Amino acid sequence: TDFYTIKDAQADLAIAPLNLTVLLAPYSTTPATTLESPTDGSLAIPPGYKSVGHFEKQAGLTLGNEFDSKDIEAYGEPEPIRTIINKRTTTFDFAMYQNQRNVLELIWTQDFSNIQPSEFGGIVLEAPKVPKNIYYRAILVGMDDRNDRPIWLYWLMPKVKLDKLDNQTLNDDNVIEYKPTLKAFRDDVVGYSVAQGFAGPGWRDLVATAGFGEALTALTITPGSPTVTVATGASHTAQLLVEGDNGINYTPDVVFTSSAPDKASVSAAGLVTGVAAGSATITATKGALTATATVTVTA
Amino acid sequence: TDFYTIKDAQADLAIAPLNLTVLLAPYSTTPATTLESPTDGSLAIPPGYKSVGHFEKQAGLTLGNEFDSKDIEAYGEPEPIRTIINKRTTTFDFAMYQNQRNVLELIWTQDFSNIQPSEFGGIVLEAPKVPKNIYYRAILVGMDDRNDRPIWLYWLMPKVKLDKLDNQTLNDDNVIEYKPTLKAFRDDVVGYSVAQGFAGPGWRDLVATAGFGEALTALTITPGSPTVTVATGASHTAQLLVEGDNGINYTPDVVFTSSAPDKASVSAAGLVTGVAAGSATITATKGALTATATVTVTA
Amino acid sequence: QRNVLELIWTQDFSNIQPSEFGGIVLEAPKVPKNIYYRAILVGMDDRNDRPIWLYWLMPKVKLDKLDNQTLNDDNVIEYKPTLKAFRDDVVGYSVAQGFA
Amino acid sequence: TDFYTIKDAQADLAIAPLNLTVLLAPYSTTPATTLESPTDGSLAIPPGYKSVGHFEKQAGLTLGNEFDSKDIEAYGEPEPIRTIINKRTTTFDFAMYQN
Amino acid sequence: TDFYTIKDAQADLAIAPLNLTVLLAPYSTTPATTLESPTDGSLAIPPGYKSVGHFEKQAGLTLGNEFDSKDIEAYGEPEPIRTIINKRTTTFDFAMYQNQRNVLELIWTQDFSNIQPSEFGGIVLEAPKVPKNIYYRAILVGMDDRNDRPIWLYWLMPKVKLDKLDNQTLNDDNVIEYKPTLKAFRDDVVGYSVAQGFAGPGWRDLVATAGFGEALTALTITPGSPTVTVATGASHTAQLLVEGDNGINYTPDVVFTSSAPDKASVSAAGLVTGVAAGSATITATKGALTATATVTVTA
C-alpha cells in the first residue's frame, strides 16, 4: 500500500462558503431545527427570520470557540486525573453595512418597532436608559455553488446576545460599518447552543463519502408496479419515488427513461402518466445503478 | 427559493458619510431633538450650535461604544443566570484643524468669551488654574449625496465632556491638529445619552425598505376638492398636500399635472391657482402610483 | 467529514442519520466531552524512488484548543485544532518518533 | 436595415483644432462664462485674459483626466456594490516659446 | 490519415470585422437580447441605441478580459486542489472622433439632455462637481462582407460604465479624439455581462461547419399542398417556407422553380400566385438538395 492510498484525500469535501448570509429572528420566533424543506430538500427559511443584508467582504465572518475547564491534579500524577470542562463559549462577528431596522435594534439593544417616521420620513433612534438584554435566534447559512449543485451549510444558534461592539470609524470614502460580536447561549427548549448542518443537492452526493450514513450500493423504486388511468382525473398521474440502501431519496439524482413512450409518459422528475393502455417499463438510472419498474395502463 | 432571494441585499441602504461636520453648543442651549425642519423636511440646525470647522480626513471620526456588565453566576450553571449592564459608554474622537474660539475653549476647558484682543489683535489664552468640568451638546451630522437626493444622518449627544487629549505633534510641513476624545453622558431632561437619526429626501425613499413604518401602497391628496378664486387675494391660491398609507408626506416626490392648464395652474411643488373659472383635474403621480383631485374655479 | 467534525465538536456522530435528502444537523453537546484518540502522523520523503516514512505515534490525544474560524468567500473552511498528547499506560509512552 | 444606416457616420462632426491658443488671467479676474458675444455670436474674450503666444507644434497641447475612486466590496459580490468617485483631476500642458 | 485531414482547416470560418460600430443606450433602455430580426433575420437594432459614429482606424477597438482567482493549496499537493475564480472582468476601448451629445455625456459622466443652445447655437458643457456612476447598454456590432453574404457578429454588454479616460492630445493637423475605456458589469435582469453572437445570411451558410447544431441533410417545404385562388383576394397568394432537419430556415438560400409557369408563378422569395387553375409543381433547389411541393389552383 502506497502513501497516497493511505492519505485518502477528497478535494470535493472541502466546502468554500462562496456566498453567506446571517438571518436574525426575535426570541419569540420558534427556533429552526433544520434548513432542508421536507418536500424536496430545498432551502426553506422558517418565518420570522430576516436577513441583515450585506456585510464587509474583507473582514468576513469570524467564528470563535473557547473552552473553560478546571483540571484536578492528584499527588504523584504529572497529568490531571480528571478534567472538568465547564463551558464551550461560541462567538461570531462581522461588519454589517445596511442601516435597516433590525441591524440598529441589535446594535442599540432596543425595540424600535414602535418608532414611527415623522412627516417627511425622518426618524430619531434614542439609546435606552440602560442597555437591555435582548436575545435573538441566528441562522448563518452559506452556499457553495459547484457545478450548479449548491451545498448549503448553516450554523443554527437558537439564543444569541450582543457581546461586544467594535469601534465605529467614519470615513468619507467608505460606508458606515456596524461590527458586533455576538455570543451564543444554550437554549433549553432545543437543548443546544450551536449546531452545524449541511444540506442541498451537492451535499447529497458527498454525504456517503463524508462518513454519515452508509455508501449507496443499491437503487430501488418504491412504487414498483403502479396502475395508471388513461382518462383524465386525480388518479390519472402517479409520482414515482426512488430510494437507496441508506435511506436517502435519490430521485432528483437519477435519470428517468420509458421503454415505450406512448404507453406511459415519464418526465425528468419521475411522474408517470398513461397516454395509452398497455404495459410499460420505466427505468431510473444513476451512474452504474439501475432500477426498473413496470406500469400497467388501463383505460 | 434560491439563496439570493433569502439574502435580500439592498445596496441602497448602505450609507456613506460623504461629508461630515460636528457642531458644539454650550450647555445652556436647548438640546436638539431632531434635525428635520417641520416646514419641509430640510436640515435645520437649532440656534446656538456652532461648527468646529475642518478636521483631518485620514484620521476621520472614530466612534467607540463600551459595555461594563457584571454577571451573576449560580451553582451548577455554566452560563450566568442574570447579567447586569451598568452603562453604555460612548466616545468619539477626531482631529480638528481650525484655531477658532470654541475649539480652543474645548481643548483648554475654559470659557474664553471674556478674552479681549489686544490693540493689534494679539490674544493670549491661559490654561485654567485647575481644569474645569464643562459640558457641551454635540451634533455629528453627515450628508450622503446620491443622485442629488441627500441623506442626512446625525448623532445627537446632548451632554458631552472632554475625556482625553492626544499628543500634539508640530511639523514644519503640516498644520496643527487638536485631537480631543469626547465622552457622552446621559442627559436627564431629554432622556438619552446618544441618539442616531436619519432624515432628508434620500432617506424618505428608503424609509419603507429599511423597516421603519409600513410600505407605501396608496397615495391620497388630502385637499381633494378645493375651490379657488380667479381674482387675486389671500384665498386666490391653494396648496396641495399628498400623503401615503404610512403617513409620510410625499409631496416633493410626486409629479403634478393639470388636466386643463388654463382653468387651473399647478406647479411642481403643488400650488393651485385658478386662472379661469371652470373645472380642472390635478393629478399627482409617483412611479406607478397615482392620485387625482378636482378643483372648481369661481370668479 | 465525520471524524473531523467529531474531533472539533467533542461528540460522537456515529448515531447521526442523514435525512430524506441527505441533509444532516450536528448539535454541539450540552457539555464538551473528554474524548481521547490515537494519532499517527506519518510523512513520506520520496528520494530517488526510495521513500522514507517517518511517523509520530501518540496513543492518547485530546482536543486541547480550537483556533478562530474565519469565513471568506474566496477560501475554504478550515478547522484548526491543537491536540495535546497524553501518557498511555498500556503502551508505555506519550509520543514516539519512528523511521522506516 | 443595412450596416451604413445603423452606423449613422458623419464626417462633419470631427472637429480638428487647426489653431489653438491658451489665455491666462489673474485670479482676481471674473471667470468667463462663455466665449460667444451676445450681440452677434462672435468670439468675445472677456477683459483680463492675456494670451501666452506661440507654443511648440510637435508637442501640441496635452489634456489628461484621472479618476480617484474607492470601491465598496461586500461579501458574496464579485463586483463592488457601490463605487465612490472622489474627484476627477484635469491637467493640461504645452510648450511655450515666448519670454 | 494524412496531416491535412486531421487538421481540418476551414478558411471560411475566419471572420474579419470589415466594418465596426459601437451603439450606446441609456440604462433605462430594455437590453437587447439579439440583433437578428425575427421577421427576416436582418440586422434589427432595438430602439434607444444611438451609434457613436466614426472612431480611429489605427487604434481600432480593443477588447480585454482578465480573471481574478484564488488557488486553494493543500499540504503535499504541488497543484491547487481547488481554484476559486471570482469574476471575469471585460473591458473595451476605442478612439471616438465625433463631438456629439452621447459621446460628451459618456466622457464627462454627465447628462446634457436639458442643455439648451444659446441664441447663436453655442453651448457650454460643465463637468460635474463629482463624477457620476452612469451605466449604459452597449452593442459592438461588426460586418464582414464575403460574396455579397454579410456576417454580423456582435458583443452585447447590458451594463457598461466608464472606467478610464486616456490622455487627449491636440494637434494642428489631427482631429480631436476621445479615448474611453469602458468596463462591462453584470446585469441581473438579463443574467450576463457580455454575450457574443453571430447572425446574417453569410453565417447561416457556416452554422453547420462551425459546430453549432447538426448539418443540413434534408430540405422540406412546410406548405406541401397549398391552395391559391385565381380570383384576387386575401387568400389569393400563399407564401412557401423551406426548412431543414437542423431547424434553420433556408428559404432565401434556395432557388424556386415552377414546372408550369401559367398555372402558378413563383419568385425567388417563394410566394405562390395562382394565375391559371390547375396542378403545378414548385421545386426549391439548393446545392445538392431539392424539395418538391404540389400547388392546386382553383378558380
CSV table of C-alpha atoms in Angstrom, one decimal, chain E residues 36-218:
chain,number,residue,atom,x,y,z
E,36,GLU,CA,-31.5,39.2,-35.5
E,37,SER,CA,-34.9,40.3,-36.7
E,38,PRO,CA,-37.5,37.6,-36.2
E,39,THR,CA,-39.3,38.6,-39.4
E,40,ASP,CA,-36.4,38.1,-41.9
E,41,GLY,CA,-33.2,37.6,-39.9
E,42,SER,CA,-31.8,41.0,-40.9
E,43,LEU,CA,-29.9,43.3,-38.6
E,44,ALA,CA,-32.5,45.0,-36.3
E,45,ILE,CA,-31.2,47.3,-33.6
E,46,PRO,CA,-33.7,47.8,-30.7
E,47,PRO,CA,-34.8,51.4,-30.3
E,48,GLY,CA,-32.9,53.6,-28.0
E,49,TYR,CA,-29.4,52.5,-29.1
E,50,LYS,CA,-27.7,55.5,-30.7
E,51,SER,CA,-24.4,54.9,-32.5
E,52,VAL,CA,-21.3,56.9,-31.6
E,53,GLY,CA,-20.2,57.3,-35.3
E,54,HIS,CA,-16.7,57.2,-36.6
E,55,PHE,CA,-13.7,56.1,-34.5
E,56,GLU,CA,-10.0,55.8,-35.2
E,57,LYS,CA,-8.9,53.2,-37.7
E,58,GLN,CA,-5.3,52.8,-36.5
E,59,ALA,CA,-6.2,52.2,-32.8
E,60,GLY,CA,-9.2,50.1,-33.8
E,61,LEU,CA,-11.2,48.6,-30.9
E,62,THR,CA,-9.5,46.7,-28.1
E,63,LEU,CA,-11.3,44.1,-26.0
E,64,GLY,CA,-9.7,42.8,-22.8
E,65,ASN,CA,-10.6,40.0,-20.4
E,66,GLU,CA,-9.0,39.4,-17.0
E,67,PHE,CA,-9.6,36.7,-14.4
E,68,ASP,CA,-9.2,37.2,-10.6
E,69,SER,CA,-8.9,33.8,-9.0
E,70,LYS,CA,-7.6,32.4,-5.7
E,71,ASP,CA,-6.0,29.0,-5.5
E,72,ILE,CA,-6.6,26.7,-2.6
E,73,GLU,CA,-3.4,24.8,-1.8
E,74,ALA,CA,-3.1,21.7,0.3
E,75,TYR,CA,-0.2,20.0,2.0
E,76,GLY,CA,1.6,17.6,-0.3
E,77,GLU,CA,-0.1,18.8,-3.4
E,78,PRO,CA,2.1,20.6,-5.9
E,79,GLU,CA,-1.0,21.9,-7.8
E,80,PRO,CA,-4.0,23.6,-6.1
E,81,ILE,CA,-6.9,21.3,-5.1
E,82,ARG,CA,-9.5,23.9,-5.9
E,83,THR,CA,-9.3,27.2,-7.9
E,84,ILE,CA,-12.0,29.7,-6.9
E,85,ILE,CA,-12.5,32.1,-9.8
E,86,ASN,CA,-14.3,35.2,-8.6
E,87,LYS,CA,-15.0,37.3,-11.7
E,88,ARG,CA,-14.2,37.7,-15.4
E,89,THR,CA,-13.7,41.5,-16.0
E,90,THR,CA,-14.4,42.5,-19.6
E,91,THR,CA,-13.3,45.9,-20.8
E,92,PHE,CA,-13.2,47.6,-24.2
E,93,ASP,CA,-11.8,50.9,-25.6
E,94,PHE,CA,-11.6,52.9,-28.8
E,95,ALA,CA,-10.9,56.4,-30.0
E,96,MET,CA,-14.1,58.3,-30.9
E,97,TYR,CA,-13.9,61.3,-33.3
E,98,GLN,CA,-17.4,62.8,-33.3
E,99,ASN,CA,-18.3,65.6,-30.8
E,100,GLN,CA,-22.0,64.7,-30.4
E,101,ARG,CA,-24.2,64.6,-27.3
E,102,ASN,CA,-23.8,60.9,-26.3
E,103,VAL,CA,-20.0,61.0,-26.7
E,104,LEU,CA,-19.6,64.0,-24.5
E,105,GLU,CA,-22.1,62.7,-21.9
E,106,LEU,CA,-20.2,59.4,-21.7
E,107,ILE,CA,-16.8,61.1,-21.3
E,108,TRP,CA,-18.0,63.7,-18.8
E,109,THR,CA,-20.1,61.4,-16.7
E,110,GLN,CA,-23.0,63.8,-17.0
E,111,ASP,CA,-26.3,64.1,-18.8
E,112,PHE,CA,-26.7,67.0,-21.2
E,113,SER,CA,-30.3,66.4,-22.2
E,114,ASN,CA,-31.6,69.6,-20.7
E,115,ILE,CA,-28.7,71.7,-22.1
E,116,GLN,CA,-30.3,74.2,-24.5
E,117,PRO,CA,-28.2,76.0,-27.1
E,118,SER,CA,-27.9,79.8,-26.9
E,119,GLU,CA,-29.3,82.3,-29.4
E,120,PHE,CA,-26.4,81.6,-31.8
E,121,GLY,CA,-26.2,77.9,-31.2
E,122,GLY,CA,-23.3,78.0,-28.7
E,123,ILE,CA,-23.3,75.5,-25.8
E,124,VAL,CA,-21.3,75.1,-22.6
E,125,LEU,CA,-20.9,71.7,-21.1
E,126,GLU,CA,-19.9,71.9,-17.4
E,127,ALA,CA,-18.2,69.0,-15.8
E,128,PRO,CA,-20.0,67.7,-12.7
E,129,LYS,CA,-18.6,68.6,-9.2
E,130,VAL,CA,-18.1,64.8,-8.6
E,131,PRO,CA,-18.2,62.2,-11.4
E,132,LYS,CA,-21.5,60.2,-11.5
E,133,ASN,CA,-22.0,56.5,-11.8
E,134,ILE,CA,-23.8,56.3,-15.1
E,135,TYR,CA,-24.5,53.0,-16.7
E,136,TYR,CA,-25.1,52.3,-20.4
E,137,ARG,CA,-26.1,49.4,-22.6
E,138,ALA,CA,-23.5,48.8,-25.3
E,139,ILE,CA,-23.7,46.9,-28.6
E,140,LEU,CA,-20.4,46.3,-30.5
E,141,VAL,CA,-21.6,45.1,-34.0
E,142,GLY,CA,-19.3,44.3,-36.9
E,143,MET,CA,-20.0,43.4,-40.5
E,144,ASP,CA,-17.9,41.1,-42.7
E,145,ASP,CA,-18.8,41.0,-46.4
E,146,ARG,CA,-17.9,37.9,-48.4
E,147,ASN,CA,-19.5,37.2,-51.9
E,148,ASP,CA,-22.4,39.6,-51.0
E,149,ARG,CA,-23.4,37.4,-48.0
E,150,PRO,CA,-22.7,39.6,-44.9
E,151,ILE,CA,-22.0,38.2,-41.5
E,152,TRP,CA,-22.8,40.4,-38.5
E,153,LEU,CA,-21.0,39.5,-35.3
E,154,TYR,CA,-21.8,41.4,-32.2
E,155,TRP,CA,-21.0,41.8,-28.5
E,156,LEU,CA,-23.9,42.7,-26.2
E,157,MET,CA,-23.0,44.4,-22.9
E,158,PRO,CA,-26.1,45.2,-20.9
E,159,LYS,CA,-24.3,47.2,-18.3
E,160,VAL,CA,-21.1,49.2,-19.1
E,161,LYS,CA,-19.6,52.1,-17.1
E,162,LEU,CA,-16.7,54.5,-17.8
E,163,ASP,CA,-13.5,53.1,-16.3
E,164,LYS,CA,-10.6,55.0,-17.8
E,165,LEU,CA,-10.1,58.1,-19.9
E,166,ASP,CA,-6.8,58.3,-21.8
E,167,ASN,CA,-4.8,61.5,-22.4
E,168,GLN,CA,-6.3,63.7,-25.0
E,169,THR,CA,-3.5,65.2,-27.2
E,170,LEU,CA,-4.4,68.2,-29.5
E,171,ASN,CA,-2.5,68.7,-32.8
E,172,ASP,CA,-2.9,71.3,-35.5
E,173,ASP,CA,-3.1,68.5,-38.1
E,174,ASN,CA,-5.2,65.9,-36.3
E,175,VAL,CA,-8.8,65.8,-35.3
E,176,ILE,CA,-9.8,65.7,-31.7
E,177,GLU,CA,-10.1,62.2,-30.2
E,178,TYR,CA,-11.8,60.8,-27.0
E,179,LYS,CA,-10.3,57.5,-25.7
E,180,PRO,CA,-12.6,56.0,-23.1
E,181,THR,CA,-12.0,52.5,-21.6
E,182,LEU,CA,-15.4,51.0,-20.5
E,183,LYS,CA,-15.8,48.1,-18.1
E,184,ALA,CA,-18.8,45.8,-18.6
E,185,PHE,CA,-20.6,44.9,-15.4
E,186,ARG,CA,-23.2,42.1,-14.7
E,187,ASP,CA,-26.8,42.9,-15.3
E,188,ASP,CA,-29.1,40.7,-13.1
E,189,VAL,CA,-32.2,41.3,-15.3
E,190,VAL,CA,-30.6,39.6,-18.3
E,191,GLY,CA,-28.2,37.4,-16.3
E,192,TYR,CA,-24.9,38.2,-18.1
E,193,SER,CA,-22.2,40.8,-18.5
E,194,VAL,CA,-21.1,40.1,-22.1
E,195,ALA,CA,-22.6,37.9,-24.8
E,196,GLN,CA,-21.0,37.2,-28.2
E,197,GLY,CA,-23.5,36.5,-31.1
E,198,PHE,CA,-23.4,35.8,-34.8
E,199,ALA,CA,-26.1,36.4,-37.5
E,200,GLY,CA,-26.6,37.1,-41.1
E,201,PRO,CA,-27.1,35.2,-44.3
E,202,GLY,CA,-23.3,34.5,-44.5
E,203,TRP,CA,-23.4,33.0,-41.0
E,204,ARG,CA,-26.3,30.7,-42.0
E,205,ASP,CA,-24.0,29.1,-44.5
E,206,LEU,CA,-21.5,28.4,-41.8
E,207,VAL,CA,-23.6,27.4,-38.8
E,208,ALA,CA,-23.2,23.7,-39.6
E,209,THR,CA,-19.5,23.9,-40.2
E,210,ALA,CA,-18.9,26.0,-37.0
E,211,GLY,CA,-20.3,23.1,-34.9
E,212,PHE,CA,-23.5,24.7,-33.6
E,213,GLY,CA,-26.2,22.2,-34.3
E,214,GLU,CA,-26.3,19.5,-36.9
E,215,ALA,CA,-25.6,19.8,-40.6
E,216,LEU,CA,-28.2,20.3,-43.3
E,217,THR,CA,-29.0,16.9,-44.9
E,218,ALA,CA,-32.7,17.3,-46.0
